[PDB]
Structures are given as C-alpha cells and as structure tokens.
Write a protein that binds this ligand. Structure first.
Ligand SMILES: CCCCCCCC/C=C\CCCCCCCC(=O)NCCO
Lengths: 279, 288
C-alpha cells in the first residue's frame, strides 16, 4: 500500500493542477481537461526553452560558399549584431580571418554529407563602437539539403563554460601586480609581462634568477621563512611584504601572496604560484 | 460488490486519461497507472510553465543541439527532459519526467547539484554531473540496476517565473590527441603540435603538462583535472597553452580516463599563437 499512498498523493496533486470531488470524479475531469489542450512539448515551446537555457542563436549557411541562408533574431542579443549584418553576407564575413580554413573544412561535405553532425569553435564579430571585436562561439549543427543545395543548420552559443581570466586586470591604468611561478628553490620559472610595468624588468631578466636576489637583505630572512611556510602549507595562501629591488625606483614595497600548486593526483608540488603586488 | 464496480470505473477512466497523453498510438499500453498519473502531472506542470512564457524552423533547434534539455525544479524534480535524452542515457523521457534528479545522479555529485540549485554571471550555471545511463556500444543493453555513470557537462540558467534549465551534453570517448599518465605527464602528443605550438612530440614526453599552461588559468585547469580524476571525464574552459619559442595559444580540452589507467585529451585550437615575441616561462627562454 506504498503503491496507493503514492496514488492518493498523485490524485490530490492532479486535483490541485486542474483548474476546477472524489478520486474518480477528479480523474474524470482530468480526462476532460486533458482534451481541453504528438510530442510532450511543441517545437515552439522547446525552441524557447533551449533559448532560455543557451545564450545562442540559430543560423543556416550554405556549405559551399558560407552564404547566410537564415539567421534568427537571437543573434542580436547574443552577438550585439543586427540581422542587417548577417543577411546578405557569408559566415566568413562574420568569423575571425584565422578561423576561415577551419570553417571551410567544417562546411565541406566530401566525407560526411546529409544528416552528419558538426561540432566546432570559432570567433565571431560582435557589434563594435569603433575595428572588430571577436567573441568565442561554440557551434553545433547538422548538414541538410536545402530545397549547390547542402547547408549547415547550426546553433552558436556563448558562455558554454566558465570564462577565463583573460587579463587579471582590476584597474584601467598601469598594472599593479604580476603573476609568477617558482620552483621549490625559488627560481623564476614563469612571469607575465606586467612585470615590466611593476618592477621594470623584462620577463627574461627575472626568469632563471631567484626571487631572493630581488629582495632587500634586511627582509630576506622574512621572505625565506614565508616561502618555507607555503611549501609546508600545501595549497594554503600566505602573504609577505618585503622590499623588492626595482630597476629604476630603488626599493619598492611589495606584497607577494604565494601558495603551492598540488598535483591533483600525486599531490606533489608542481610549483609555487605568487601574486606580486606593489603595496 | 459495487466497490469494485466503481474501481473498474476509476481505472477505465485512468486508461482514458492515458489515451489523452501526448504520446504515440500504442505507447499507452506499456504504461502502469502510477506512470500514467505521473506523466499527466508533469504534462500539466510543463504546460503551466510554458503558458508563463511571453510569446516551421522551430524543430531545428533541438536538432542543432548535441545534448538534451533538462528543466529541474527548486526541489530537484526533473520537470522536463527532451526526447533525445534516450540517445544519451538510454532512459527515455517516458520513464524520467516527474522523478527526482537525486534518484538518478551519483551520490557524491548531489552536493554540487544542490549548490547549483541555490567570472560567471550571477545566474549562469556550469557543472559536471554523473547520471544513470543504460547505454552501451550495442544500445540500451543494461537493466536499470546495472546502469553505468555517464558524465554530462550541463550549462544553463536559473529562471524564476522557479527553475534551472540546462543543456546537458556528453563528452565523447576517444583528431589532435595527447596521452598522459594520471599525473598529467605527457606520454604522447599529436605530431601537429609543431605547426601549432612549435614543440617536437618527443620533446614533450616526460614533461608535466601543468608547466605548459598560463598561470592565470592554472586554478581553472586544476579544478577540471580534479573532475577528470573523480568522475572519469572532464572538459575545461578556454585556457592558454605556451608555445615553444614564446607566446601562447587559446585552446580547449576534453579529457577521459581510460583502462593501469591513462588520460586521453582531445584539444581544440581556439586561436593561433599570440604575443610570440614575449617569453613567459624559463623553457621558452632557453629555446629562444
Ligand atoms: C583537464 C585536462 C586539460 C589538460 C590541461 C593541460 C593540457 C595540456 C596538454 C596538451 C595541450 C596540447 C594542446 C594541443 C593543441 C592542438 C590544437 C589543434 O590544433 N587541434 C585540432 C584542431 O582544433
């Protein structure tokens, strides 16, 4: 009778869901209200659901020339581009010039033709105030004969995964910090170009040298103690402030926040990652 | 004895209700009263939801997607699943709509799901899930209790009008490949790396892959690898891979644990080498 405690719950649920009684009467009115209204949802409803879930737009292009046969209105809320720019053009007019060969190979029907699937990433022009700006679009679709007749029917979506830290920039002016990686001995094995603006050294002037070679002697013990902390703290972040030896402004107060990168499998120390910020 | 007469009346009219469902001619006869009820409940709820939406080529959209659409309630109830879910999990929508998602996902992914139910924009969701699937290389050959765990990359939006609507896609099991041990040290890499990044495939063998990613992406990559190691498959976001003489290229990666156990990575190039004059790592500097 766990079978009809769920059936009584089912029938009460159905009663609540119908816009209008004992079990047979509520299920007899269910029948009538069912005939009030073959797939579960309609293609229109499913289109709107998909567009509620995906930041994407549908486009049909000719396989031979890339000519835009159709594009949905969704392209403007997605790509900041009116349908004016897509209709009457080709897909190659919309993509980054370095993606043209890849798109042409995706549009060829020499091995996979009618019904076959396509999956590829490219970069498309967005609406620009100035000089085009490109955004990464994930495209999935299928090849279909179009009543010189093969076409790609595809959807292009943004934000399929999390966005990357493209810049690390938290200002609009000269950078305040730079990221570095170090081995267990403290040797610079990675540094991004912002170091030129923060400490005046080119990346190659830092790589290969130890971080302590750039620290004030009076601070060095402190820097070394903190580093020996983070290799023992296995992942946790520790911050230290010392006098970094710049190339033109003498001794700069610098806050380095460090943590060890643990190998997700072997738990070995791949390197130490530091954010070096001018205090 | 009029009780069972009324009882036959009741289930005659529930079979009537079954014939009122939006499924093909004959599909009625493979159902039980409980599932008939459940499907009717969920049809009405999805109709109520679609009625709240303010609104020929419509059928291309589901055809254009690879994965399936799923609508989950705030209480984790699978409000809707498209038909093509049968192509990804074997379980059709006939047996899934109405049931709870927590009855079909791996027990160590339920916390992640619930955190998702409560760099990114406030209401966009990206998460990996392990769902029950009865599919093999021969079709739906597994009965539900021997079902396997299929990893789905699910991305979508929290829409309150209160739902979480997702596109859930499968990660294909393995053009440009790389093979690593579980510590992600290169055991093999496609010969096309030379024209893409500058590296001879022999020069990468034994090297740790983490040395070849931009530091700005490490965290992200790290998380992905964890998923790869705990669920069997993973897919990263866009990340920067360092070229040989300098600079980096934008790329994305799908990864699968195989077999003792190895990792296979399929890489998709997003851009060409940027900032080739700039050296970023110690290795680029020596090879420069
Ligand atoms: C969670 C696992 C993620 C791995 C993280 C590190 C991977 C580095 C290993 C390998 C990186 C190799 C990138 C290969 C570039 C080739 C691109 C190409 O031309 N492909 C065909 C056309 O698109």
């Amino acid at each position: 009778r766990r079978r009809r405690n769920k059936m009584t719950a089912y029938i009460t649920e159905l009663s609540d869901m119908v816009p209008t009684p004992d079990k047979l009467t509520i299920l007899r009115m269910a029948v009538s209200h069912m005939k009030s209204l073959p797939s579960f949802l309609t293609d229109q409803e499913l289109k709107h659901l998909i567009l509620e879930a995906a930041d994407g737009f549908l486009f049909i292009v000719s396989c031979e020339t890339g000519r835009v046969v159709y594009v949905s209105d969704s392209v403007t809320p997605v790509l900041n581009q009116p349908q004016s720019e897509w209709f009457g053009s080709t897909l190659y007019d919309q993509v980054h010039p370095d993606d043209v060969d890849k798109l042409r190979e995706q549009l060829s029907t020499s091995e996979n033709a009618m019904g076959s699937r396509r999956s590829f990433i490219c970069r498309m022009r967005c609406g620009t105030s100035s000089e085009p700006h490109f955004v990464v679009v994930h495209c999935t679709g299928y090849i279909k004969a179009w009543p010189s007749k093969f076409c790609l029917v595809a959807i292009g979506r943004l934000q399929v995964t999390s966005s990357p830290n493209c810049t690390d920039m938290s200002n609009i002016c000269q950078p305040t910090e730079f990221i570095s990686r170090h081995n267990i001995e403290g040797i610079f094995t990675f540094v991004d170009h912002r170091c030129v603006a923060t400490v005046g050294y080119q990346p190659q002037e830092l790589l290969g040298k130890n971080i302590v070679e750039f620290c004030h002697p009076e601070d060095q013990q402190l820097l070394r103690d903190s580093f020996q902390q983070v290799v023992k703290l296995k992942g946790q972040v520790l911050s230290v402030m010392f006098r970094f030896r710049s190339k033109t402004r003498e001794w700069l107060w610098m806050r380095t926040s460090s943590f060890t990168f643990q190998n997700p499998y072997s738990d070995e120390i791949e390197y130490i990652i530091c954010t070096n910020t001018n205090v | 004895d009029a009780a069972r007469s009324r009882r036959s009346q009741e289930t005659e009219v529930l079979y009537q209700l079954a014939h009122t469902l939006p499924f093909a001619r004959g599909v009625s006869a493979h159902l039980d009263k409980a599932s008939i009820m459940r499907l009717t409940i969920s049809y009405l709820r999805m109709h109520r939801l679609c009625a709240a939406g303010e609104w020929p080529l419509d059928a291309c959209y589901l055809k254009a997607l690879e994965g399936f659409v799923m609508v989950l309630t705030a209480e984790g109830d699978m409000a809707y699943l498209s038909e093509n879910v049968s192509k990804h999990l074997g379980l059709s929508q006939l047996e899934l709509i109405g049931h709870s998602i927590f009855d079909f996902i791996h027990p160590c992914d339920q916390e992640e799901l619930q955190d998702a139910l409560t760099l990114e924009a406030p209401t966009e969701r990206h998460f990996s899930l392990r769902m029950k699937s009865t599919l093999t290389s021969r079709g739906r050959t597994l009965n539900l209790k021997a079902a396997t765990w299929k990893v789905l990359h699910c991305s979508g939006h929290m829409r309150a009008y209160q739902c979480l609507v997702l596109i859930c896609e499968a990660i294909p099991h393995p053009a440009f490949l790389s093979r690593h041990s579980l510590d992600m040290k290169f055991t093999y890499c496609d010969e096309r790396i030379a024209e893409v990044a500058g590296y001879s495939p022999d020069d990468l063998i034994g090297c740790s892959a983490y040395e070849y990613i931009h530091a700005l992406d490490s965290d992200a990559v790290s998380r992905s690898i964890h998923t790869l190691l705990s669920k069997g498959q993973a897919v990263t976001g866009q990340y920067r891979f360092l070229a040989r003489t300098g600079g980096y290229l934008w790329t994305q990666t799908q990864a699968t644990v195989v077999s003792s156990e190895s990792i296979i990575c399929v890489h998709f190039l997003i851009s060409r080498v940027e900032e080739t004059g700039v050296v970023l790592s110690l290795e680029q500097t020596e090879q420069h």
